Amino acid sequence: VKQHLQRETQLKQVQQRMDAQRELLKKGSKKKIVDSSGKISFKWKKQRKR
Amino acid sequence: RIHVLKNIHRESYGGVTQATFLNGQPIIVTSGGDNSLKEYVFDPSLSQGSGDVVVQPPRYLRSRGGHSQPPSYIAFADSQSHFMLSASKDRSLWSFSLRKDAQSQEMSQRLHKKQDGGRVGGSTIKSKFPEIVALAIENARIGEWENIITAHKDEKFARTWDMRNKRVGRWTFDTTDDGFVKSVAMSQ
Amino acid sequence: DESDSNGDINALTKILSTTYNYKDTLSNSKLLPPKKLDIVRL
Amino acid sequence: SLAKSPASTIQILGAEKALFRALKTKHDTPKYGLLYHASLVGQATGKNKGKIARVLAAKAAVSLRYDALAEDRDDSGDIGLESRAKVENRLSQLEGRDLRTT
Amino acid sequence: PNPKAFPLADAALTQQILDVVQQAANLRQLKKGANEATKTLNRGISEFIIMAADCEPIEILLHLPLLCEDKNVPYVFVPSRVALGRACGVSRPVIAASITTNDASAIKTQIYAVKDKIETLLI
Amino acid sequence: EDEEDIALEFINGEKKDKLVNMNSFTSMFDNIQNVQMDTFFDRVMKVLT
Amino acid sequence: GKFRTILIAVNAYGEVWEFDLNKNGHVIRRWKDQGGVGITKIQVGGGTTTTCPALQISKIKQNRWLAVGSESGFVNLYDRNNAMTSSTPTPVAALDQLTTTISNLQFSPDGQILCMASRAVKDALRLVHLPSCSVFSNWPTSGTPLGKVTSVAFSPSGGLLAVGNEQGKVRLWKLNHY
Amino acid sequence: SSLSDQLAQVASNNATVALDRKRRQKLHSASLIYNSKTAATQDYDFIFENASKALEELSQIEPKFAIFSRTLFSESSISLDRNVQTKEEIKDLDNAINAYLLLASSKWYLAPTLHATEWLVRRFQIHVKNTEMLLLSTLNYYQTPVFKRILSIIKLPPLFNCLSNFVRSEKPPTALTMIKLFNDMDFLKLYTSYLDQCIKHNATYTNQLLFTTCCFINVVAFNSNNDEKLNQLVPILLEISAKLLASKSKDCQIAAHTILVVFATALPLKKTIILAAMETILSNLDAKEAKHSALLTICKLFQTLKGQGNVDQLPSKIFKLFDSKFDTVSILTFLDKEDKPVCDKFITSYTRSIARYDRSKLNIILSLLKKIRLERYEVRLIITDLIYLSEILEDKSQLVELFEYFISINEDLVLKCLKSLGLTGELFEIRLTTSLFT
């Protein structure tokens, strides 16, 4: 049961990373934000989807 | 009413002073006081059964022309005395042949695309350049690049022209001191 | 065929024969027309 | 349970074998399931069948959630009729579009 | 508003909910639509659910409180679907929005504050 | 009063009208089969108003 | 020779207060903007505004139109003659031609044009015909040098439009109808 | 020009001539019913028997078809070849074919029409020679498979080029394709000639009129953003609207009403053109549905107007014509109608015309103003006209009642009108010989 839990959370983290990249692939104005810790984040512009 | 051709000749010089249909022909020859002589023709109908009901508008066939106002400036375009360049106060630059009047042609003022890729600017309702007050032409590099410089009235830049293509060229030469162009010259 | 020499059905045909510009522009309507704008750069 | 299912499930209901073999082998998923036998999807042609399947699954989810969760209901199917009118509008638009150049 | 719409928030809580929804829209932490809210409830990746009380008919929304009671997820009602759509950042009205789960999110503190304020209504 | 005030009365007089665009009557082709001309006129007036 | 001054104030939620400044600033009324979230601008038009004032007391007129502009790019437009009664009024139109925050709302002195503009992006200015509530199509144009529109002014009489932008340029246009 | 281009012209001239067996096979296989295999084996007599039976049934349905039994469906037509005729004889045969197609346009949903038109397809080659009239006559049926069969065997004229990809295809032409077909100007001239022939020979019918009305309205909508295209569309559509209004058919008149309403909404027209169209509408108006459509058309046309003479009274002739066609109680019940389209401009012009000309229905003016809600500029114009009428007319009663109504509703407007005309309210009391002011 513990190994099922660990596999589930590992797959969750992988899927989150894939979905972040799949959001970068789309249409919009985005800004790369580099944290001092080194984590890479993207913030989108305040603009409404037409 | 089949059709109206609007402003084929200028109102100030008298509009359509004469228009004659040629005998047995779908060709009408028109003229006005603006030193033009034009021809228009009627194409056959696009309908076979209908015919006379469906009439295409008259289209421009061929014309001869000249300046509508006295020439501001003249020059000889070559050493053979074949051609002359003449700019007039009606803002047109023409090339007139001394050997055959059919070879006379108006230099085109259609602009080129800028090299950087930015937009040129100016009014979308296109008007001719200001009247030319000076001209220099050198045929040492005709066909390679621009060989005419013209200075236009009340402008701070000069224009270049190509005599081989008979069209305005791609460079405008500035004075860089905020002054009007009084003189143009070219190297041999 | 023809020589020119109580409502009438030919009123629209006659007015179409007369006028050449059909849109109203000389009225100075002083209501602003909807979709096209007359604006010039100064 | 059918009301609590989203529209994307209702579109592909009955095509679980192809759906899950595609989801497990990284291939293309079914465009439609049991809803291929509705009358509107039959009237659709070509690539418009999947579009009408998507639209019809969304409207069917709307009508079916109304049909299961409404405490007071007149048994007339007026919500279903309005959704059917919307699907027929979309179908008429899709069929009126043409791809060959005129 | 419809009596089935519960819990409907007041003006100040509506302000805070819509501000957090706007921040999540800018951070791409937001799912729009009742179908996608249903998907996030099923997959367990939803912080809380916002639903528009003026949806007509309301039973398009009414399947979401059952799922929220099953998976123990907070849900709240805001009055206007036009307001919800404009906060979600789209040109269409939106009747249901879901705030997704992210621990590295910069708006985590606001999400967890509004989540507690919603839970006080559900108590 | 002034002529400017009278002109403002005209301008406040004019009210909202629906405009014609290119996809205003494309759906009329669906129902020209069994209906009558007065029904078609009523539908057209409904679109225009 | 007598008139009253009303202060119309809006918060970010969409709730709108109307105060009577002659009666010690007490509240005439309160209502709510339909749709209404992230409101940045409010502006009356069609009468004497702060943009276009009166030259005498008899020239003071009421404003026919009200416009409310939001962060999302939406502008809700209310006809005041019907909107003063409801206390939850419905707009005549909701304009979504712009997708960034509404930072400039202006009306013509007659109120036939509403000029809406955003400073967030380049060339975000639209002219809206009233009462048809329809955006003009031919202008502005892909080659119009608006820039990032930070300020807009309408001429009181001449029908001029002045647009000031982030490069410091104020460009000037004339509407030939006026 | 090329030798190949000149030979292409030669081939187009000698298209229908069967110069050998293969050309005869290719020309004769074209049929509306049978496939090519059967069509090549059939002879002229068998087709003539079937076509004569079909024409007998067509004559039992519509009696006018019996005139063609002596000219096209006679036994002498079996041996009539077009290519050996002269131009005058071919012109006469073309007139007869045009008249038959015009008469047979409405009956294309019937089975005998197809079998009878087989004879014209195969003897007289109308799908090659009379192509345009065939397409224009059958153009309403673009859903139906008979138009598909016509498209399959037909050649396309230059004006019918939007249909070039729908030849030999299972999918029918679409409504967008028909709009693109109509959107050409020369096609519109050809179609207005066809409608002129239909109206002149009284061959218009309801499905045709619905199709043409929808296509014209969609052409106007498609060109609505080009003012030059609309300005070119003014003469064609307004001539065909005048011709449809001249028709005795109420369906033709309703079609013209629809065209006028849509076209006036799309393009702001001159008041002279609006008044002339109103005169043409009112002139030949004799059926009840036509009256009901025409009143709404007049209200919308006058609501369109925005110039300086917007609210001005009607001319005397047009006003008397309107009063003869539409009666006072009909105007009243039109205002009682719950729909009530926006008609304040027309109602105000009607009121000012009544006050100018009739001088006897001032109580009717009162009833109209009670039942409609007018705007301030319209009420001001009415009040000024009534003040002038109070100065002229000797009797004050009919006018003074109106003036207590105007004191009851917007009294201050009456005061400002009096001040603008230079009259004090007590002076107007002296004029009306009654104290009506507070």
Oligomer: part of a larger assembly
CATH class of chain E: Alpha Beta
Q: Report how far apart the termini of chain E are.
A: 21 Å
Rough outline of chain E: globular
CATH homology-level superfamily of chain E: Ribosomal protein L30/S12
Overall geometry of chain H comes to elongated
- What is the total domain count of chain E? 1
Helix content of chain H: 55-70%
Q: Taking strands numbered 1, 2, ... along the chain, how are they ordered across the largest sheet of chain E?
A: 1-4-2-3
Order of helices and strands of chain E: HEHEHEHEH
Described by strand count, sense and barrel closure, the largest sheet of chain E is: 4 strands, mixed
CATH architecture of chain E: 2-Layer Sandwich
Number of discrete helical segments of chain H: 24
Number of strands of chain E: 4
| Overall strand count of chain H | 0
Sketch the topology of chain H as an H/E string, one letter per element.
Answer: HHHHHHHHHHHHHHHHHHHHHHHH
CATH topology of chain E: 60s Ribosomal Protein L30, Chain: A
Subcellular location (chain B): Nucleus, Nucleolus
Function (chain B): Involved in nucleolar processing of pre-18S ribosomal RNA and ribosome assembly.
WD repeats (chain B): 13-65, 72-106, 133-172
Subunit structure (chain B): Interacts with snoRNA U3. Interacts with MPP10. Interacts (via WD repeats) with UTP18. Component of the ribosomal small subunit (SSU) processome composed of at least 40 protein subunits and snoRNA U3.
Structure characteristics:
part of a larger assembly; 8 chains; A: 50 residues; alpha+beta; 46% helix; elongated; H: 438 residues; mainly alpha; 24 helices; 67% helix; ribosome; 90S
Would you kindly provide a written description of the structure presented here, covering whatever features stand out?
This is part of a larger assembly, with 8 protein chains of 7 kinds. Chain A has 50 residues and is of the alpha+beta class. Chain A is built from 1 helix and 2 strands. In chain A, strands 1-2 form a two-stranded antiparallel sheet. In chain A, β1 and β2 form a beta hairpin. Chain A starts with a helix and ends in a 6-residue tail after the last strand. Chain B is mainly β and 188 residues long. Chain B is 0% helix and 36% strand. Chain B is elongated and about 65 Å long. The N and C termini of chain B lie far apart (59 Å). In chain D, 61% of the residues lie in helices and 0% in strands. Chain D is built from 5 helices and no strands. By secondary structure, chain H is mainly alpha-helical. The radius of gyration of chain H is 31 Å and the shape is elongated. β1 of chain C pairs antiparallel with β14 of chain G, so a sheet runs across the interface.
